[PDB]
Each structure stands twice: as C-alpha cells, then as structure tokens.
Design a protein around this nucleic acid. Sequence first.
RNA 1: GAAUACGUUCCCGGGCCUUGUACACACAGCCCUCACACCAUGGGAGUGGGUUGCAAAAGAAGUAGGUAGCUUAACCUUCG
Length: 70
Amino acid sequence: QEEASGLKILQEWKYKNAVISFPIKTISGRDVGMEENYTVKFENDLVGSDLRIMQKLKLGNEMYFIVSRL
RNA sequence: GAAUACGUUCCCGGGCCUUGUACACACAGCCCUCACACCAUGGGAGUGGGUUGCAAAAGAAGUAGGUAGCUUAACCUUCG
Ligand SMILES: [Mg+2]
Ligand SMILES: [Mg+2]
Ligand SMILES: [Mg+2]
C-alpha cells in the first residue's frame, strides 16, 4: 500500500508483543532476495523507537517473529 | 537331424511428398512468485517574480499651456 510503511500498525494497536511469520520457500538458492526482504526491512528500521525484538526462528516454511515494546 | 509361412494394416531404418513453425547446435510451445530500489518522463497544496496586462489612485524630471503674486540691462518710452 505504501513504500516502507510497516512500523506504523503495531504501534496504532497499543500493545506488548506479537508473532509475525513469512514464507521461506527459497528453491535451492532461487527465491533468495525476492523472499528475504520480509526481514531486512525490520532490523534496519528497528533502531530508534519503543519497538524491539525478543527471539527469531526459521523452520518448516514459516519464520516467526517475536516483538517487544517498553 | 526332421511335421514343410493361408498373409504385410504396424517407429532397427530410409526414400518420394505436403502444410506450417512458439525453428536454425535447428521440436516443442497458456504465472507460483515482490519491500522492489535508482536514474528518465507525465503530473503536481502552496512560493516567487519576469513581462506585465486590467479597475484605478498617486506623478520625479522635462516639454507645453494658463496665470491677479513676485521680479527685471538691451526695445518703445508718453518718459508715471
Ligand atoms: Mg526414424
Ligand atoms: Mg510600464
Ligand atoms: Mg520649469
């Protein structure tokens, strides 16, 4: 819906934690890049506000995210 | 050491020929996946003038006109 506008929603819904996953169906080094961006848009953009991270996994076909706020 | 193919519609492989083709190493052709950057174009709240047009107001210099104030060497002086 917009270019680089993800950090907005979590905050709007006043909260504490979450769980956020994505597909990891990289076909033996094919979907690399075209599927490894649901992440690098986090760690990069996640310095500055009340948002933080708790844990991270990558098994099966879904990589769940755990988030924290103060 | 002998009971003895009635028959070639049939990709061990080739010739004659025909239409195409998403063909020239030369035969076959209807997405499942994405924040997509960054240079080029089409826009585009407002800003701003250029050059100003338009409804006017005000009008510096100069040029011209009027003019009872004021002032003055050549001319006429009647001589006021
Ligand atoms: Mg053949
Ligand atoms: Mg003008
Ligand atoms: Mg004058």
